[PDB]
């Protein structure tokens, strides 16, 4: 997509490696925020959004939590707590066209700047001067979407780059997207290290009498820490009895 009208694939109920991403020399950058790219393989997510678009190489620095500038202002604001990867690759050999690819566009005029993920496809003539817009332009008032017009002869910062932002989400609702990491057997009544669908921890995985309602999935103590879990393969309810410790 043009960056004013960015793509959003939403990812659920599937599994992937992320090294197949971060290993590849194709990626011009692999900027990460709130997560480390190698560590993604240890995790499961409620969902991911592959928010994705083309921008010119100059603009990639704007794609951060806590940043402002033309893309962040008018096209695609990241929240100032965005969690995930911004992956970019030079696409001058893909998106640029001789005579310019004008089918890649960006906004630079609006009544006010974007809020986080505030997608906006509006086309109305913008009031860049004292005159009313009249539904027509010439001067003082103008159409709000600039075009990049990408020519393959562009200088390296003016070249197009394909961007995928992996906007991860972890909610109270349990994970549905998984890393590549292989499962193991269950081990009750022993002190063990564990990863239940992205919940990392350590304790004694006792079985329980707790009546989880059919939608209820984690149980929590007063501390807002996981007291119980329902096993994501066998659906039995386990008390995570604390790890065995005391003073000496």
């Amino acid at each position, epitope marked *: 997509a043009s960056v004013y009208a960015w793509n959003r694939k939403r990812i659920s109920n599937c599994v992937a490696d992320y090294s197949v991403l971060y290993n590849s020399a194709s990626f011009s950058t692999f900027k990460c925020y709130g997560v480390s790219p190698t560590k993604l393989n240890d995790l499961c997510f409620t969902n991911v959004y592959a928010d994705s678009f083309v921008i010119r190489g100059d603009e990639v620095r704007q794609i951060a939590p806590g940043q402002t500038g033309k893309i962040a202002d008018y096209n695609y604001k990241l929240p100032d707590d965005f969690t995930g990867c911004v992956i970019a690759w030079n696409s001058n050999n893909l998106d640029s066209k001789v005579g310019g*690819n004008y089918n890649y566009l960006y906004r630079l005029f609006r009544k006010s700047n974007l809020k986080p993920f505030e997608r906006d496809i509006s*086309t109305e003539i913008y009031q860049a001067g004292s005159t009313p817009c009249n539904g027509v*332009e010439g001067f003082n008032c103008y159409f709000p979407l*600039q*075009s990049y017009g990408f020519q393959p002869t562009n200088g390296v910062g003016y070249q197009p780059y394909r961007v995928v932002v992996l906007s991860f989400e972890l909610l109270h609702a349990p994970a549905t997207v998984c890393g590549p990491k292989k499962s193991t057997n269950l081990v009750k009544n022993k002190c063990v290290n564990f990863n239940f669908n992205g919940l990392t921890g350590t304790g004694v995985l006792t079985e329980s009498n707790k009546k989880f309602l059919p939608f209820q999935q984690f149980g929590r103590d007063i501390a807002d820490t996981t007291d119980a879990v329902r096993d994501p393969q066998t659906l039995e309810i386990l008390d995570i009895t604390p790890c065995s410790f005391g003073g000496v």
Partner: antibody, heavy 123, light 101 residues
Framework: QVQLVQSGAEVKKPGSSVKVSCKAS????????INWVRQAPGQGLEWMGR????????NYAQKFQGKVTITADKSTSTAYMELSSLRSEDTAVYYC????????????????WGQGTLVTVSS | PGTLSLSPGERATLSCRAS???????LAWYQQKPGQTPRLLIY???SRATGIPARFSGSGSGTNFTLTISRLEPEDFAVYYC????????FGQGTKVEIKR
């Protein structure tokens, strides 16, 4: 290209429409608007409408609202105008041109004019 | 249309009839051989990076934005239309230039 390939005599009767047609260079749908105008033969010229081929969205001056209907093929830059309230006294010349493209253009002015359409109407 | 007569080699200067409002830029002057397809002669106007570079100018008064044919050649003699920009795109009927006798 330059001379947009406007259809000719479009010979017609009142209480009707005609799909006037025209041609502009292949990629230009992505890089220019098409604008439309009327002229009585040997007499004054006035503006009539517009299309923005990025979306195919069109606009009209109030005299031509409902009387005119503009469309275009975004895949070829072929252009069209249904003269959607045609009359004998509407037997004027009609014109279109490549135009606009905002503060990304050098100055918004029209350049490739069409070869004209004397829509020839009588009762 | 209204008409002015001039000899070949004269310098023309004619008012935009649409200049009822001033506009923050002029657009262009379009020539026509009567009724036929118009032709762009002055362009990009209120600048001077304007028109077919052999002749012409548009900055000849800061409202009238005159058809300023720098030295009339025999093919410049025609009817003309005048157009201006400030949330605007409208045409005025210019003035015709004819060969004087």
């Amino acid at each position: 290209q330059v001379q947009l390939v406007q259809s000719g005599a479009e010979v017609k009767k009142p209480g009707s429409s005609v799909k006037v047609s025209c041609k502009a260079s292949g990629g230009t749908f992505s890089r220019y608007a098409i604008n439309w105008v009327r002229q009585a033969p040997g007499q004054g010229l006035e503006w009539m409408g517009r299309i923005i081929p990025i979306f195919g969205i069109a606009n009209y001056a109030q005299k031509f609202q409902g009387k005119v209907t503009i469309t275009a093929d975004k895949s070829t830059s072929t252009a069209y105008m249904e003269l959607s309230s045609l009359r004998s006294e509407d037997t004027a010349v009609y014109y279109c041109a490549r135009a606009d493209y905002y503060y990304d253009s050098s100055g918004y002015f029209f350049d490739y004019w069409g070869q004209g359409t004397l829509v020839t109407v009588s009762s | 249309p209204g008409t002015l007569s001039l000899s070949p080699g004269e310098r023309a200067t004619l008012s935009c009839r649409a200049s009822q409002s001033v506009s923050s830029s002029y657009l262009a002057w379009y020539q026509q051989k009567p009724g036929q397809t118009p032709r762009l002669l002055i362009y990009g106007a209120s600048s001077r990076a304007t028109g077919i570079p052999a002749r012409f100018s548009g900055s000849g008064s800061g409202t009238n934005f005159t058809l300023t044919i720098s030295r009339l050649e025999p093919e410049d003699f025609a009817v003309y239309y005048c157009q201006q920009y400030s949330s605007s795109r409208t045409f005025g009927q210019g003035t015709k230039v004819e060969i004087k006798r």
